[PDB]
Amino acid sequence: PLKVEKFATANRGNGLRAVTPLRPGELLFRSDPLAYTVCKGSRGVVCDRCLLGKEKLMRCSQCRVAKYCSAKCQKKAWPDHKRECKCLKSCPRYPPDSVRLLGRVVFKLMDGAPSESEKLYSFYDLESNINKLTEDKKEGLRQLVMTFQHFMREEIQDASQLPPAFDLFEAFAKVICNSFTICNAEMQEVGVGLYPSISLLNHSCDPNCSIVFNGPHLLLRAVRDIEVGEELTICYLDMLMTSEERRKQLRDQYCFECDCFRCQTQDKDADMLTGDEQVWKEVQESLKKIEELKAHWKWEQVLAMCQAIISSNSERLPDINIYQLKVLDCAMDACINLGLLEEALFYGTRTMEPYRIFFPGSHPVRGVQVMKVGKLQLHQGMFPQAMKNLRLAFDIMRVTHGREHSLIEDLILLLEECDANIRAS
Ligand SMILES: C[S@@+](CC[C@H](N)C(=O)[O-])C[C@H]1O[C@@H](n2cnc3c(N)ncnc32)[C@H](O)[C@@H]1O
Ligand SMILES: CS(=O)(=O)N1CCC(NC(=O)c2cc(C3CC3)on2)CC1
Ligand SMILES: [Mg+2]
Ligand SMILES: [Mg+2]
Ligand SMILES: [Zn+2]
Ligand SMILES: [Zn+2]
Ligand SMILES: [Zn+2]
Prior knowledge:
alpha+beta, Annexin V, domain 1, 48% helix, globular, binds S-adenosylmethionine, binds the ligand CS(=O)(=O)N1CCC(NC(=O)c2cc(C3CC3)on2)CC1, binds magnesium ion, RNA polymerase II complex binding, zinc-finger, Histone-lysine N-methyltransferase SMYD3
């Protein structure tokens, strides 16, 4: 039986609420996507199907755009790739991610059996916020509609090839406020998908639930105690954002004004912005390029830019400043991927206290970060320190990831290895 149910909220549209009392870590729902694709930066880096990285991927011979880790993935992906394949081949132009995503929505709705992803709420039901769109946003959606019509012309010529009364403008409006960014085990963004049942969850800047991805598969878990009838919330946004930054994104993407306690009080903003404003404004600007490079897996270039900040001859920022913290995290991940494990541990350890502050309670991003640090410590022989961090990662990740997520198995192996080392000491 389901532990969650759809309901009509008083002022947030539809939402999801608890049917039974829920405890931290309880699995509330799990879902494959209605439709999903690899994101722009990870195309050709991770498998189109399973979203895992590999040194060499094999390409679809027909379109040479879709790429896969294995014959198994390429073959299993064929039914959901077959129609877009003809469109991608007809396109050296590659569509925006949202256009490729909507193509897969249309093909799934036209050719696929009813999707379990739509059990609680369907693509047809999703919020569009059309009456809140500003004119500039409408113009952007009109351009996406025309982009879709161009890209899909080989497979979709008339309304007979779309679901009944399907409106492409409305569909793109739904995609804007209902797309989920799929993250790999290391918390790198790798894809985008629609999960219409999960789209019932409203946003909170201090939520009681959390989602995590295991490949394209989404797990929804409680991260606080939740009472019968209490609304379930997730945080739509990166935690390393000020209330002004959250306000802008919640308006621009989601068309709402957040009334939560954190927004009313600018909770943590001042700490997030400590240090000299001229310095952090420059770092924030540099992070556009750093994050672009990271999205494309260009670790050597990421690291060079990060070192120029972290070890600048010029003025520096405290590690609790969120822009400095993002630079440290990018540098850590670059060092891990480049095998510079001593340097990775230096940056990673510096992030630990800021992460404790900015990811309160049980948050999967902190769990993964702590696990990465513990793993670095374990393989450099720091057994007691590694064990403390691996146990802390497990305390978080038992709640945020759970036994159904494969990363928990990897963590259990690290704990057993570290424990065996301490026992032989
Ligand atoms: C992923 S949908 C959530 C389900 C949605 N309420 C519905 O009726 O389908 C995101 C949209 O829900 C609304 N929403 C989500 N969180 C909200 C909040 N804290 N306050 C007001 N509206 C919210 C906004 O319309 C937002 O664009
Ligand atoms: C744990 S996280 O910090 O790494 N996390 C947060 C940023 C991103 N979130 C979303 O894509 C998203 C979208 C929605 C609703 C459809 C609106 O809810 N969440 C994924 C990763
Ligand atoms: Mg509606
Ligand atoms: Mg409305
Ligand atoms: Zn694969
Ligand atoms: Zn193809
Ligand atoms: Zn808020």
